[model samples]
Target: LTIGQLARIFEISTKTLRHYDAIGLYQPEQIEQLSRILALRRLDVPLEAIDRLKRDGALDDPQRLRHFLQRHQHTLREEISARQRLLAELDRTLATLAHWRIRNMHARIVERPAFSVVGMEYDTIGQLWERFIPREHEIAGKHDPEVSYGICAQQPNGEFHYVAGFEVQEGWPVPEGMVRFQVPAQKYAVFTHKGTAPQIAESFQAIYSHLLAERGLEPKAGVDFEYYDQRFRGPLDPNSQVDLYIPIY
Candidate 1:
């Protein structure tokens, strides 16, 4: 019979028959076999069952039936093993991701004593640091010559006041054009930001997003200073080590 005739008998489209014929799934004059296979398909018979009847002319032949049954078991075992290996790999990948978050964004809590700093406020910390670095030696009674602080605090008027200056010992007179202030002792959550200045925001995001939540810490209303020591090369240097101190309860 023609392809159109087969399509009419099955009430399917001619294009579907053409596609089946093109894929060697069904051919003209194989209508009887096709109808038998389609009928078995309607009964939800497995493809191998239909295939065995079509190729070997029966499903109950002794040796071929046993052979395919054994082969089916082998195929199932192979597939199960492959899926188990994939599951193991996925577990390892998830574990590594969890470890990486903790490894790179680890936080430490410490108690710091009260400290004093004589620094002038500026609209921008970059400009303040530029002016303060040149006049650092002029300030009297430096606490640690190698250490500097970038203090950022919010004023009552909703503006941020940034002071870039060195830590000073007790009774150090404020330099000209600079004001003096004291940082009260408190517990702090310290994080090391280990990259260029531009990449510093990534560490802060990590700290605020998940690190603090994981540690059950809440940031207190106080100054969070950037502690820079000899380990800091420059703002743009990749090897810079800047410690971020966040006051926390």
Candidate 2:
């Protein structure tokens, strides 16, 4: 079959198929003389093996799959050990950031906890943001402006919850079923994300893999919150700004 036909069969883009070929991951058997089309043959490549290789960043070349996997395993082990060491250092640094406070207009340094909670959850991060915008107005209408907030918690069971509306203060009417949480004062490593929600993952990956890791800052127990500030120009706006706050401790 032609490369395009094979790509259709595999349900992948032709560009992706071409990328695979260029990277020597998969190659066409021959090029048609008349049409200059690629004739792809059915090789003995196992789908499972292909998937594994791709997951481990080793599927760029089929010929090197075995070597790539071996190297990848070694690299993965090293990465894990490095991250473990970095996490220890980060914990200590987080303790320091937690104690540090900035002075407010009242001449007293109010300990503003560096934690934040967003109000949406999904199986994937992409889906979470997809549901956040539409429900924003609903949340605003139902909850009080003063104390109402939201939390997106990733439970120990790997499930997620979109928690919204804060607990009412004493002498105030309480909203039904609202949970109360205390956020401690601490410093956060903040990053401003400006783009579509799908691209947010790239920012996360960059921060976790490069910036945080390089600075020996490990992610603590607090949920990484996306503060949708005034700059958030709804879902359709590409220029919208979202503040990502990662609590150290």
Among the numbered candidates, top TM-score falls to 1
Tens-digit lDDT string for candidate 2 (1-249)? 655555544434667555655454424532221111121124223443454444465424456645755776677789889999999998998654322311110111122443333333333444444444454443323323333233455468866665543323333333333333445455557666666556565566666665666566666665545556567665457777566666653
TM-score for each candidate, following the candidate numbering: 0.57, 0.40
Candidate 2 accuracy as lDDT? 0.49
Candidate 2 residue spans exceeding 4 A from truth: 1-111, 114-150, 164-185
Decoy 1 TM-score against native = 0.57
lDDT of 2 at 112: 45
User: Each candidate: RMSD to true structure?
Assistant: 14.8, 16.6
Q: Local error of candidate 2 at 109, Å?
A: 16
Please report how far candidate 2 places residue 10 from its true position, in Å: 46
Cα displacement (angstroms), candidate 2, residue 92, comes to 41
Task: Encode model 1's per-residue lDDT on 7-117: one tens digit a residue.
Answer: 576757667556554444436556565665555456445764455464555433455646755776678789889999999998998766644644676678989998888
Residue 228 CA error for candidate 2 (Å)?
1.1
